[PDB]
Amino acid sequence: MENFQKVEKIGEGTYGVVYKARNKLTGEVVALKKIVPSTAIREISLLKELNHPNIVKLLDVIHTENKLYLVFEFLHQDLKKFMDASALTGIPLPLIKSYLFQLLQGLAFCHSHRVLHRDLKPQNLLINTEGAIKLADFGLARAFGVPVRTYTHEVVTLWYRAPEILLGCKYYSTAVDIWSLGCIFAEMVTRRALFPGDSEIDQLFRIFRTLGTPDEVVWPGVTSMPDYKPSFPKWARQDFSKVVPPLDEDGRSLLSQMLHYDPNKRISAKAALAHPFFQDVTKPVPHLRL
Numbered sequence: 001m002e003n004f005q006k007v008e009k010i011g012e013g014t015y016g017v018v019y020k021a022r023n024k025l026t027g028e029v030v031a032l033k034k035i036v037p038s039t040a041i042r043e044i045s046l047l048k049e050l051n052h053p054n055i056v057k058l059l060d061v062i063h064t065e066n067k068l069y070l071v072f073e074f075l076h077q078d079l080k081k082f083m084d085a086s087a088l089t090g091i092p093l094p095l096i097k098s099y100l101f102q103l104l105q106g107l108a109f110c111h112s113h114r115v116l117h118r119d120l121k122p123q124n125l126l127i128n129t130e131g132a133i134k135l136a137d138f139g140l141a142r143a144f145g146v147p148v149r150t151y152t153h154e155v156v157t158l159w160y161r162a163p164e165i166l167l168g169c170k171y172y173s174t175a176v177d178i179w180s181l182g183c184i185f186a187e188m189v190t191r192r193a194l195f196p197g198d199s200e201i202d203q204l205f206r207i208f209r210t211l212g213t214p215d216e217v218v219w220p221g222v223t224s225m226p227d228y229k230p231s232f233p234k235w236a237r238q239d240f241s242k243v244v245p246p247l248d249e250d251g252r253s254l255l256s257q258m259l260h261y262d263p264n265k266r267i268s269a270k271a272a273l274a275h276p277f278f279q280d281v282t283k284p285v286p287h288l289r290l
């Protein structure tokens, strides 16, 4: 740590406080995360090699005095902040499309290496002035696990959690990240969280009320899942036309696929990249006020 000078606190992560810091030597500006089981060390260490333009680079891992610091590339804003700042007019569709496309590329990369994020949310999506957006905390969930509360005791959001996780599936797949990103895509479009659940049951029921209570028809095997209850209310599915106005048909088509109940049927990142929605994708520059 003596190698870094903390400049300011840039946020509180699930695992610890994140600081903007300067390397006392190179002068390099980085994000320092203060998070140990040997299993966590190996897993995290492997993350140093999982490199992609849309994945926040893990520069170094520092384990000292039984403390763990992760040195990451620094980005100037997060998507949650950016969305709040664009509330009045919303993020232009071409930029939303570009962000989705890049995030899917980042997911496609990680998933091809059999690495899941597991906790995608606007706060871990970071953007720069060049129109890039990157995934932060990839792999940390498997390395340290996802808690119900953060180190500061703040509640870990459930809004983006896939239904299979809520239903007790122990071995969920890369499909859970596609679900989360679909929820995020909807939120960028409407300027409102799609399923802002405040408990595991509220999150589940919010999903059911919009997409319909899942059954064996749409999701073979669902009634068997650990936390499934035959007593769940049976709600009918709403039209995506009401859910994400005024997203065009291509966007709604893609969203609908990213939110398929059956994780096996849910579109993969790679297939999503080929969706017609991205036929006219461009890379606009956002207006950032740093």
Ligand SMILES: OCc1cnn2c(NCc3cccnc3)cc(-c3ccccc3)nc12
Pocket: 009, 010, 011, 012, 013, 018, 020, 031, 056, 072, 073, 074, 075, 076, 077, 078, 123, 126, 136, 137
């Ligand atoms: O992945 C490392 C990371 C790299 N940049 N970064 C940023 N940067 C944007 C920013 C924000 C505030 C001031 N200057 C810059 C925020 C968070 C974060 C962490 C936890 C919660 C929210 C944001 N994590 C990171």
